Structures are given as structure tokens and as C-alpha cells.
Design a protein around this motif. Structure first.
Motif, PDB file in Angstrom:
ATOM      1  N   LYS A 151     -24.803 -43.876 -52.761  1.00 28.35           N
ATOM      2  CA  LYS A 151     -25.798 -44.783 -52.206  1.00 28.35           C
ATOM      3  C   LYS A 151     -27.138 -44.108 -51.927  1.00 28.35           C
ATOM      4  N   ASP A 172     -30.575 -44.552 -50.032  1.00 29.09           N
ATOM      5  CA  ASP A 172     -31.171 -45.319 -48.937  1.00 29.09           C
ATOM      6  C   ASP A 172     -32.596 -44.863 -48.650  1.00 29.09           C
ATOM      7  N   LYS A 217     -35.814 -45.341 -46.036  1.00 20.38           N
ATOM      8  CA  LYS A 217     -36.155 -45.830 -44.694  1.00 20.38           C
ATOM      9  C   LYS A 217     -37.654 -45.962 -44.477  1.00 20.38           C
ATOM     10  N   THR A 265     -34.734 -50.533 -43.604  1.00 17.46           N
ATOM     11  CA  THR A 265     -34.128 -49.545 -44.481  1.00 17.46           C
ATOM     12  C   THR A 265     -33.336 -50.253 -45.555  1.00 17.46           C
ATOM     13  N   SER A 270     -31.335 -50.317 -49.357  1.00 18.10           N
ATOM     14  CA  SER A 270     -30.505 -49.378 -50.101  1.00 18.10           C
ATOM     15  C   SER A 270     -30.100 -49.909 -51.473  1.00 18.10           C
ATOM     16  N   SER A 287     -27.020 -48.725 -54.397  1.00 23.26           N
ATOM     17  CA  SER A 287     -25.882 -47.869 -54.687  1.00 23.26           C
ATOM     18  C   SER A 287     -25.134 -48.326 -55.909  1.00 23.26           C
ATOM     19  N   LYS A 318     -30.944 -36.938 -45.204  1.00 25.65           N
ATOM     20  CA  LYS A 318     -29.493 -37.011 -44.972  1.00 25.65           C
ATOM     21  C   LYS A 318     -28.731 -36.886 -46.287  1.00 25.65           C
ATOM     22  N   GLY A 356     -24.068 -40.219 -49.657  1.00 27.21           N
ATOM     23  CA  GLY A 356     -25.102 -40.897 -48.895  1.00 27.21           C
ATOM     24  C   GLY A 356     -26.386 -40.090 -48.918  1.00 27.21           C
ATOM     25  N   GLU A 359     -30.077 -40.537 -47.704  1.00 26.97           N
ATOM     26  CA  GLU A 359     -31.059 -41.312 -46.962  1.00 26.97           C
ATOM     27  C   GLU A 359     -32.286 -40.469 -46.686  1.00 26.97           C
ATOM     28  N   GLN A 367     -36.160 -40.194 -44.992  1.00 22.95           N
ATOM     29  CA  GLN A 367     -37.029 -40.732 -43.953  1.00 22.95           C
ATOM     30  C   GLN A 367     -38.465 -40.842 -44.462  1.00 22.95           C
TER      31      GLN A 367
END
Length: 285
Positions: free
Chosen positions: A28, A30, A32, A42, A44, A46, A256, A278, A280, A282
Motif C-alpha cells: 500500500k 499512502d 498524507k 490521506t 492511498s 494499493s 513510514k 506500508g 506512508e 508525510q
């Protein structure tokens, strides 16, 4: 110590450790975007590492736990829409009012709930009014605390049929840092959690699910091991022989990177192992 549960909020912390993650298999992506109002958008995108599928999501958080006015909004491609407005600390001790709105595909199934959980040391009373066509249904939980015990009574009053069928008896026994939470569902299937504060960096939760019969208990052991402020290891072993390994790395830079692996000891040789990632980020870098 007041520890005011409520069938749904019985051992909320242990439930929270178990809920995050749990069930992977998709890498995934993501992105943000921080809103200034506090919307927190946020989105996403995937895919499934086995089917090559593509599934995304829309996470929108308005406000936060500031003055207890968290209005969470979850939209997904499957068309599921979810809005949760919560007002905590309304009186002074522990007063929570959660108006919920869940609109799912099922012929535009509208789920409108009003949870009112008044708390007062050892005593928690929740009133969940579900305004649905089958509803209004009244699902509340009355918990009383004692010498390290949490007992709960969940009364579901289906007003359309005017029948009290759905009822859940919560029974809990306390142990140092550890809580024993179980619930009898309709006198048929038992299920609950075990809140275990192991130490400052270790918060784990054991889920106990069994079925009134001669059958076994499916139970999991979920451990959330915060390593350092920038890294944490999540693992969960069910009793059907499924060990999950989820390594999460939070970088100051605002990145992340999480890895997931659910291997079935009864099928390590058959497979069906969830592989998810995952990623993610920022804001823009």
C-alpha cells in the motif's frame, strides 16, 4: 482505576493493539496531506501481491482527541462511507457521545448509531441507539466494577420486532497490569481480550475466542513492541498456528516503512501467507 468499559469499549486499549494492521497481503502506497483546519486528508493506493489487484482508501480526520471532538471520516472505493462524531468528557468524569453514520453498498444500508456512555468509577452505562429500518435497536452495556472484576450486561432491544434476543454477558478478572475480558454472546459463542501492560515499551493483547461445545479456543497473541521512538515491531500468533511478523519503521524525516508476513504453520507448506507493505509519506519532500 475507574476503568469504565462498555461492551464495545471493554478493554478498548487491547482491542486497539489488535485492530491496527491485522490482515495484510497488499503493498500500500499512502500519501498524507496535512490540512490546516484539521481535516487530515490521506489517500492511498494499493495492490494485492497475489492477485495483482488495486485497492485504495480515503482517510479523512477532522479535529482529533483535542477537546474530545474527533469527527472521523472513512471513505473507500467499495463505496463504504463512515462518519464518527465523538464528544468525550462532556460532563466532567467520563461522558462519551458517539453519533455514527455508516452507509454501505447493501441496498444503501444506512447505519445511524448514538452511543452514550456515562462513566462513574467502576460503573459504565452505554446506550447505543441504532436508527435503522430493522432498528431502532437499543444496544447498551452496563458494567460494574469490584475487587478487580468487570462484569457487563449488553441488552439489545429490537424495537421493530420488539424482541430482546441479542445479549452479551461480559466477565472480567483483573491481574497485575493484566486484564481478563471475556463475553458470552447469546449464551452461544464466547469472545473477548486480555489487556497486558508488559512494560513501558511493550503493550500486548491476547484474544480469546471459543464456542460453547467441545471445540477448541482460537486465540491470538498480539505484541506491539516499541523499539525506539522511530521503530516498532508488531507480531500476532493465532492458535490455529498462524504467526504474523509486522515490522514498522517510522523515520523522523516523516517516512513510514512497514513489512508484513503472515505464515501458516499448518500451511507454511501450503502458503496463503499475507505479504503486505506500508509506505506512508508525510507531505511532499
Amino acid at each position: 482505576s475507574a476503568v469504565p468499559p462498555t461492551y464495545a469499549d471493554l478493554g478498548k486499549s487491547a482491542r486497539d493493539v489488535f485492530t491496527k494492521g491485522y490482515g495484510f497481503g497488499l503493498i500500500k502506497l499512502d500519501l498524507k496531506t496535512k490540512s490546516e483546519n484539521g481535516l487530515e486528508f490521506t489517500s492511498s493506493g494499493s495492490a494485492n501481491t497475489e492477485t495483482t489487484k488495486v485497492t485504495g482508501s480515503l482517510e479523512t480526520k477532522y479535529r482529533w482527541t483535542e477537546y474530545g471532538l474527533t469527527f472521523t471520516v472513512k471513505w473507500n472505493t467499495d463505496n463504504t462511507l463512515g462518519t464518527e462524531i465523538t464528544v468525550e468528557d462532556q460532563l466532567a468524569r467520563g461522558l462519551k457521545l458517539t453519533f455514527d453514520s455508516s452507509f454501505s453498498p447493501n441496498t444503501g444500508k444506512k447505519n445511524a448509531k448514538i452511543k452514550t456512555g456515562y462513566k462513574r468509577e467502576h460503573i459504565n452505562l452505554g446506550c447505543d441507539m441504532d436508527f435503522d429500518i430493522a432498528g431502532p435497536s437499543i444496544r447498551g452495556a452496563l458494567v460494574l466494577g469490584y475487587e478487580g472484576w468487570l462484569a457487563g450486561y449488553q441488552m439489545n432491544f429490537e424495537t421493530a420486532k420488539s424482541r430482546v434476543t441479542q445479549s452479551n454477558f461480559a466477565v472480567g478478572y483483573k491481574t497485575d497490569e493484566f486484564q481478563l475480558h471475556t463475553n458470552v454472546n447469546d449464551g452461544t459463542e464466547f469472545g473477548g481480550s486480555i489487556y497486558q501492560k508488559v512494560n513501558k515499551k511493550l503493550e500486548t493483547a491476547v484474544n480469546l475466542a471459543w464456542t460453547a461445545g467441545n471445540s477448541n479456543t482460537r486465540f491470538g497473541i498480539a505484541a506491539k513492541y516499541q523499539i525506539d521512538p522511530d521503530a516498532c515491531f508488531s507480531a500476532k500468533v493465532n492458535n490455529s498456528s498462524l504467526i504474523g511478523l509486522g515490522y514498522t519503521q517510522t523515520l523522523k524525516p516523516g517516512i513510514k516503512l512497514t513489512l508484513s508476513a503472515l505464515l501458516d504453520g499448518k500451511n507454511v507448506n501450503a502458503g496463503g501467507h499475507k505479504l503486505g507493505l506500508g509506505l506512508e509519506f508525510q507531505a511532499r519532500s
